[PDB]
Symmetry: C2
Subunit: 109 residues, 2 copies
Amino acid sequence: PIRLPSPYGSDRLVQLAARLRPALCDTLITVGSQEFPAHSLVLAGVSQQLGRRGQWALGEGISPSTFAQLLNFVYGESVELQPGELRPLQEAARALGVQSLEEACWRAR
Amino acid sequence: PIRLPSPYGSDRLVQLAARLRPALCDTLITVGSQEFPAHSLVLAGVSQQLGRRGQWALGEGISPSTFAQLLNFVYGESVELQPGELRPLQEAARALGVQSLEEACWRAR
């Protein structure tokens, strides 16, 4: 597999938030049928577009499998991917403004 | 005046939260008549006791003036105090479990 290192694994509050979730989560992002709790503050720290509270639906041909990988990256976990998973992740990171992930994907390609 | 340096002034997410507030705040702490918005996640990072979402009232003979100083410290601002303000701040930090502030107060005394 391909491994993408996350530059967020050593922010002390991001670490704490990763251990807590779903506790204290104020955001619920909905992807087709699947539900993802998150901390609006953590999201704001990586992308102004994503820093919003409450429930909302993501609709742009982004799969739950791809969104789960983007969300782990944001919470400081390295991501490990199969070959055909890189391009959909890059496209999701572009559309949602997560610049650090977009560039990691384009590097591994 | 006496100055207490805060050890939180360089956590990148705490800095961002300090610039945002009251935006994205999920907690409202009520002190007599006065209202203080906060991020439950930031509070959890300094004291397990304070890491809770929603509205709640603080009642323990803690003044709004003293609570405002404790909250600024938690968000990374140094605090500047008059002589008779140190002991009430120390007592508030003891009761709410903010250990870093309790010890800074006892040092300046």
